[PDB]
Amino acid sequence: MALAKRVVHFDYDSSDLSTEDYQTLQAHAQFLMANANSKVALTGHTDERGTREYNMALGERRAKAVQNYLITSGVNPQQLEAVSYGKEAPVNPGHDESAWKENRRVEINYE
Ligand SMILES: N[C@H](CCC[C@H](N)C(=O)O)C(=O)O
């Protein structure tokens, strides 16, 4: 079940991971260590609030926060990619809170 989750979320202007996101990440860490040839692309995103520049950096910190946890957990840095899309690729349009909660995220994409 933990492995079924391919996205973790963040609070406003934060790159801190929640206790729930950590459970998810531990599952992927174990899978990646057992599958040394599996590779993952981590994409960081933000909600539409703020400049494009500000959010590109925030998205990058989010992706790297996830990357660093996996690495600390034992995942080979070679199996990981960390990139930011800033506020350019929201999953939910509309300009409201709930929607922004969905957009503050890092997606885990297996190659
Ligand atoms: N200092 C920025 C924070 C934006 C945070 C939001 N884009 C997020 O995705 O967490 C502002 O005044 O909008």
What angle in degrees, to the nearest 10, is found between the helix axes of 19-34 and 52-72?
A: 60
Domain hosting residue 83, numbered range: 1-111
Query: How many structural domains comprise the chain?
Result: 1
CATH number of the structural domain spanning residue 95: 3.30.1330.60
Ligand 1: centre distance to CA 85 (Å)? 14
Per the CB < 8 A criterion, the answer to whether 41 and 81 are in contact is yes
Rounded to 5 degrees, what are φ and ψ at 87? Answer: -105, 15
Burial profile 18-37: b = 16 or more Cβ within 10 angstroms, e = fewer: eeebeebbeebbeebeeeee
Q: Candidates 8, 15, 48, 49: which one to mutate for ligand 1, based on the most atoms within 8 Å of Cβ?
A: 49
Per the CB < 8 A criterion, the answer to whether 86 and 45 are in contact is yes
Q: What method did the depositors use to determine the structure? A: X-ray
Question: What's the gap between Cα 58 and its chain centre?
Answer: 11
Take atom 12 of ligand 1 and give the residue whose Cα is closest.
50
Question: 80: which strand partners?
Answer: 40
Closest ligand 1 atom number to CA of residue 10: 10
Ligand 1: centre distance to CA 22 (Å)? 22
Q: Other CB atoms closer than 10 Å to residue 43's CB: what's the count?
A: 20
Q: Which residues, at least 6 apart from 64, have a Cβ–Cβ distance to it below 8 Å?
A: 15, 44, 82
